[PDB]
Design a protein around this motif. Sequence first.
Motif, short mmCIF file in Angstrom:
data_model
loop_
_atom_site.label_atom_id
_atom_site.label_comp_id
_atom_site.label_asym_id
_atom_site.label_seq_id
_atom_site.Cartn_x
_atom_site.Cartn_y
_atom_site.Cartn_z
N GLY C 229 0.80 -1.20 0.00
CA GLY C 229 0.00 0.00 0.00
C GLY C 229 0.84 1.26 0.00
N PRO C 230 0.31 2.34 -0.59
CA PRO C 230 1.07 3.60 -0.62
C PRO C 230 1.46 4.08 0.77
N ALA C 231 0.49 4.36 1.62
CA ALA C 231 0.76 4.60 3.03
C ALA C 231 -0.14 3.79 3.95
N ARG C 232 -1.35 3.47 3.49
CA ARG C 232 -2.33 2.70 4.26
C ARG C 232 -2.50 3.28 5.66
N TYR C 233 -2.71 4.60 5.70
CA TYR C 233 -3.25 5.22 6.91
C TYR C 233 -4.55 4.55 7.31
N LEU C 234 -5.19 3.85 6.36
CA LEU C 234 -6.45 3.17 6.59
C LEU C 234 -6.29 2.19 7.74
N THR C 235 -6.93 2.50 8.85
CA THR C 235 -6.71 1.83 10.12
C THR C 235 -8.04 1.74 10.84
N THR C 236 -7.98 1.46 12.14
CA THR C 236 -9.16 1.43 12.98
C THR C 236 -9.03 2.23 14.27
N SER C 237 -7.82 2.61 14.67
CA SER C 237 -7.60 3.32 15.93
C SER C 237 -7.38 4.80 15.67
N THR C 238 -7.85 5.63 16.60
CA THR C 238 -7.87 7.08 16.37
C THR C 238 -6.52 7.72 16.65
N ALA C 239 -6.06 7.65 17.90
CA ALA C 239 -4.77 8.23 18.24
C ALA C 239 -3.66 7.58 17.43
N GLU C 240 -3.83 6.31 17.05
CA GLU C 240 -2.87 5.68 16.16
C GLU C 240 -2.81 6.37 14.81
N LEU C 241 -3.97 6.71 14.23
CA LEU C 241 -3.96 7.50 13.01
C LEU C 241 -3.30 8.85 13.25
N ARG C 242 -3.53 9.44 14.42
CA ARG C 242 -2.86 10.70 14.73
C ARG C 242 -1.35 10.53 14.67
N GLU C 243 -0.83 9.50 15.32
CA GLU C 243 0.61 9.30 15.33
C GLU C 243 1.15 8.98 13.95
N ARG C 244 0.42 8.18 13.17
CA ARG C 244 0.79 7.97 11.78
C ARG C 244 0.77 9.27 11.00
N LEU C 245 0.03 10.27 11.48
CA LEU C 245 0.04 11.59 10.88
C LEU C 245 0.75 12.63 11.73
N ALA C 246 1.20 12.27 12.93
CA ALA C 246 1.86 13.24 13.80
C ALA C 246 3.02 13.97 13.13
N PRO C 247 3.91 13.32 12.37
CA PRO C 247 4.89 14.10 11.60
C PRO C 247 4.26 14.83 10.44
N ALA C 248 3.33 14.18 9.73
CA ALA C 248 2.61 14.83 8.64
C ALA C 248 1.72 15.96 9.12
N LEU C 249 1.52 16.10 10.42
CA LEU C 249 0.68 17.14 10.99
C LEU C 249 1.55 18.36 11.21
N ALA C 250 1.19 19.47 10.58
CA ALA C 250 1.99 20.68 10.63
C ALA C 250 1.18 21.89 10.20
#
Lengths: 40, 78, 335
Positions: C229-250
């Motif tokens: 998968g390209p990144a597969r942010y596609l998940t089920t947990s919320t804060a986990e998605l945050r952390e997967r985006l925590a660097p991408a979050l800016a």
Amino acid sequence: PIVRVAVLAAGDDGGRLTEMALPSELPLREILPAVQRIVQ
Amino acid sequence: PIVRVAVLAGGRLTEMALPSELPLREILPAVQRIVQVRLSLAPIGGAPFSLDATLDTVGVVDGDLLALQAVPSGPPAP
Amino acid sequence: SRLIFEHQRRLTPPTTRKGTITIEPPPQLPRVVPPSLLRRVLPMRTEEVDAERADYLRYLSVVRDNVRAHAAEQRAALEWSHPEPEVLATIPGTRRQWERDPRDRDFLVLRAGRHDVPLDAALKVKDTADEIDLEPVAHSALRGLLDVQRTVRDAPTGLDVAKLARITVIGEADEARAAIRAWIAQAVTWHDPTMLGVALAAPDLESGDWSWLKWLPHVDVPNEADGVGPARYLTTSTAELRERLAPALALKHLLVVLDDPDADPDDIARLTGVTVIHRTTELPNREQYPDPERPILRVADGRIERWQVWQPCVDVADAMSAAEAAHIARRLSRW
């Protein structure tokens, strides 16, 4: 369980007829790319 | 190196990822155990590929429809 | 693995002459003197005023034709830039896919349906009277014009997301995920995957549900393979998605959606444009007159009824199916 049909499309200058064999029991939503690529 | 293609069984198309430069004698049991006389891969309404051809030279890229059907008796039906 | 796309120029549909159409006020009820039989039994009277009436009505017809031409331009443009959620299957191929740029008037605008767009043109008359009495049969016509030719009939609406920062739908399960998948595909399809980002969290992701973000390179990451998968942010947990985006979050814009009504809604924001979407179970009843930003949306049979004090805000909604979005993702993963 494929089927053998003929398709027709006339948009540019007259049309083009050519047969094919397309697998049955599947939504045409996915074959349309192929048949579009063929006769066009 | 890897390609994710829509592979057909008798529908219920699957979402599988495959190598790019490998013979198909080994994907055939791979697909027979993933989704499921010899079969072959092809585009829908397209001539089956050579079982020792490579997936990168015959032009298969992400998003394609690869089917599972028996092998013909030689002519490509142009 | 994938092909290459080149930034061919965007084509231009004929835009609007967004000017100020002006209309002359009607005549001023000319005083008519009594017929007077004495000077009327021989074989400034009504004939002249009727002539003037006819002239003004002709002028009115001309103006109506012009404004209809303007409405034609407007509907043409809006249909061009937000096609129906079936033509978009054919778009990922041709040179119009990433035809949306941050300089263009339509940017990060997400179609949702058809209803009455109010005809952005002006339609201003230069009335200068202090309640003088105007001719009845002309003023009647102008008044009956300025109300039906002022709002375009059903036209492709716009659910812009450039100034919302939060979307929260309310109502049935899959009716929601419909409009969601609908405009989320309509969004990703037009804008460069290098310009906007999307995030997902859902429990049964791979069941013909939100799985379909598999082949999505808009959900990608910079410098990471994730195997298939390209990144597969596609998940089920919320804060986990945050952390997967925590660097991408800016700014690459971010679109975080959440199929979960529970699981701490409004937990990342409340930033500067990064938009959250969250499907909710139930509504507030006495909201403090919800801001036009971060609004409330209820999904009816074919309505998307906004929450204001019910102002349907869409009369025929644009709904997508799951398999359709699947085939969309499949086609688009190619280039």
